[PDB]
């Protein structure tokens, strides 16, 4: 239901009111413009478009500025949706500010990972080595392709092929502060993402 996108800044520490150290990430936000309302009568499901930043006017198109123009804002970059929300309560062109997650405290964080190029068959899957001495020649290889009888190779025998670039949720994290005047949520733990990327933040599914 509750949902705010945003950026990724870095890592900090916070003493809580009992005095314990806690590792803390930093997520920003902005004003938060609702773009369309999708109904069953026209689209067969129910959702809400949402998008967070301000492009310059040089960097968009006449279709984008026609699509934004029923909310009277600048053209915005990161347009996404949100499902599973009971609507009411949502006009075209509102602002879903940082106020929503004051005591939410259980949150799914869905970033997108880094990227690491081609890498070996170990670093994807943790397959162990072979021996580095006693005469061998089998230091860092991906194993054997299977048995002999089927005259082929089965599928999902994992080999080399680029690390990272796919999107990963993490379930059931806590919220520490909500700083409305500076547009910052603080989260315990670790968010998948490079800096300046997107991060979606939702109220968690598993209660």
């Amino acid at each position: 239901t509750k949902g705010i996108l945003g950026k990724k800044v870095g890592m900090t520490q916070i003493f809580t009111e009992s005095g314990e150290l806690i590792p803390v990430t930093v997520v920003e936000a902005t004003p938060n413009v609702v773009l369309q309302v999708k109904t069953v009568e026209t689209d067969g499901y129910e959702a809400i478009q949402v998008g967070y930043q301000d492009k310059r006017e040089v960097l968009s198109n006449k279709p984008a500025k026609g699509h934004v123009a029923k909310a009277n804002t600048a053209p915005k970059r990161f347009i996404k949706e949100f499902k599973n929300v009971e609507l009411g309560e949502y006009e075209v062109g509102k602002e879903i500010k940082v106020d929503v997650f004051q005591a939410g405290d259980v949150v799914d964080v869905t970033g997108t990972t880094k990227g690491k190029g081609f890498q070996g068959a170990i670093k994807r899957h943790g397959q162990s080595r072979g021996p580095m001495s006693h005469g061998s020649r089998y230091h860092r290889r991906p194993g054997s392709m299977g048995p002999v009888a089927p005259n082929r190779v089965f599928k999902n025998k994992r080999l080399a092929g680029r690390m990272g670039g796919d999107r990963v949720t993490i379930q059931n994290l806590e919220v520490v502060k909500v700083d409305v005047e500076r547009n910052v949520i603080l989260i315990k733990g670790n968010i998948p993402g490079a800096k300046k990327s997107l991060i979606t933040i939702k109220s968690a599914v598993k209660a």
Partner: protein, 112 residues
């Protein structure tokens, strides 16, 4: 750096004295057995600093009953009452890791 130093100015302690690595220091740390709160004491030698702002740290070495004991601390805890600079030292290094292999009448530091 810009928002981080904004968001963490409430919790930076300001009343911490100035000490260089190589200075003997007491630590009036707090010991929490749940309800009870008593105050232990170190008297060691300061070896580390790690400049980071919010989360700098430092180490202290006793020599208690023949066995060396080393304990780090972050600076900005509410669970440290005071820090008492006691002595000073002629030291030309920044991190004094060479003290582990020494004993007694050889791990001495000079005084200023």
């Amino acid at each position: 750096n810009p928002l981080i130093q904004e968001l963490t100015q409430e919790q930076l302690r300001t009343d911490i004295p100035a000490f260089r690595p190589g200075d003997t220091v007491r630590v009036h740390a707090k010991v929490v057995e749940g309800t009870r709160e008593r105050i232990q004491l170190f008297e060691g030698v300061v070896i580390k600093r790690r400049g980071a702002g919010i989360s700098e740290t430092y180490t202290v070495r006793k020599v208690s009953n023949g066995v060396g004991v080393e304990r780090t601390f972050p600076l900005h805890t509410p669970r440290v009452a005071q820090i008492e600079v006691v002595r000073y030292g002629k030291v030309r290094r920044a991190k004094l890791y060479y003290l582990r292999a020494l004993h007694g009448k050889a791990a001495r530091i000079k005084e200023i």
